[PDB]
Amino acid sequence: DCHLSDMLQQLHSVNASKPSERGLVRQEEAEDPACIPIFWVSKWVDYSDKYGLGYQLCDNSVGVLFNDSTRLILYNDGDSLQYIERDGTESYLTVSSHPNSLMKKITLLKYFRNYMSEHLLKAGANITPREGDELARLPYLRTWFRTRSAIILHLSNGSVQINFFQDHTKLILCPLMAAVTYIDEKRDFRTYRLSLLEEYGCCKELASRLRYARTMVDKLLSS
Missing domain, CATH: 3.30.1120.30 (POLO box domain)
Known part of the structure; x- marks a missing residue:
């Protein structure tokens, strides 16, 4: 997948910026409702x-x-x-x-x-x-797999959705938009530009799930 490779680059870039390591996190500045996905599972x-x-x-x-x-x-x-x-x-x-x-x-x-x-x-x-x-x-479901912590769903439009079992949180990653939608434990939904998370920061919760995403996208790429 060219989309998976793009996604891996985008996650590499946000994670390498260590976005939770900021004095004042301003993740609201990275929100973009124009980027809300059309499709998710x-x-x-x-x-x-x-x-x-x-x-x-x-x-x-x-x-x-x-x-x-x-x-x-x-x-x-x-x-x-x-x-x-x-x-x-x-x-x-x-x-x-x-x-x-x-x-x-x-x-x-x-x-x-x-x-x-x-x-x-x-x-x-x-x-x-x-x-x-x-x-x-x-889109259709291209591939999926489960780990102990999550189910990972790769759609044919290039989107990758990760659903975390313990806390019911979910990431919907879209490489065309280079955006992530995070649905938190209380079902509040925010969509961010990944590049703007680098700039403005994000909470440690999203930062950690984004680290996990990169590893999942690597798994998708190797299989």
């Missing part, structure tokens, strides 16, 4: 022991990255699908066409949609995403 379900990783994006679309490395996405109209084969060959179809070869995968996607609707809360439900470019592409 709002719900996820790890059924990787049998089927794959089901997820919802903040626009209510649902996707799955299956164990066989294919991906199926159901748009928020409730009928349009995008199917992505193992070589990343994509095609579009509808649920209403009931294609026999995809019936199992559609059934699994509907299972995740139902589970998520009944049993999970929507991350960032208090946030209105920025106005997208009208022709922006809905």
Whole structure:
């Protein structure tokens, strides 16, 4: 990923500046609502022991990255699908066409949609995403993994989202904007330009999560 490499450079640069080591932190100066993401993962379900990783994006679309490395996405109209084969060959179809070869995968996607609707809360439900470019592409989950502390979700638009288990905090990193959105323990959401965190500083909490992010982005790059 060229986006991952860019992301690693941006995280290298903010972390090398040691942004929490400042007499007065002024992280509010680094905020930019123009940079609020269009897409992030709002719900996820790890059924990787049998089927794959089901997820919802903040626009209510649902996707799955299956164990066989294919991906199926159901748009928020409730009928349009995008199917992505193992070589990343994509095609579009509808649920209403009931294609026999995809019936199992559609059934699994509907299972995740139902589970998520009944049993999970929507991350960032208090946030209105920025106005997208009208022709922006809905991303899919490119890769993910879990560590003891977090789940790391790499979207096909280059975004990397890290969800921390212990405190429910989350980072959404966007390399095109060179921005980070941090959702804290109390669900307050702020979006910052990474370069401006270098200049103005940030709290030790964000600084530490940004160190952790760099290591996660290195893991993404090596695998």
